[PDB]
Amino acid sequence: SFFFLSFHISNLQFNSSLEDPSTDYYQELQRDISEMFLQIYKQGGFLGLSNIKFRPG
């Protein structure tokens, strides 16, 4: 099955870098959050997650 998930990271500022998928900071945050998800769901059932969308909150 597929599941959409939205959450807030309350201790990071949204900034112009996170508006631009090509920046080092955007790519680093997307990578690190993706890694985190693989750790949360460290089972054979979890295949992966999509590209991440960042929005100002």
Add this chain to the structure above:
Amino acid sequence: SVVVQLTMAFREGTINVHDVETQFNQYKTEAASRYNLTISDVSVSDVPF
């Protein structure tokens, strides 16, 4: 704050939206200690694709 939105894929089976959300919310304390991410406002839904 930074809002994060994504979709997850699980192999067909018994895993449901409650399973997914509970596992994520239970990880909040580890997200803070391990990733220094303070996670809130968790919203999970079934989607067709």
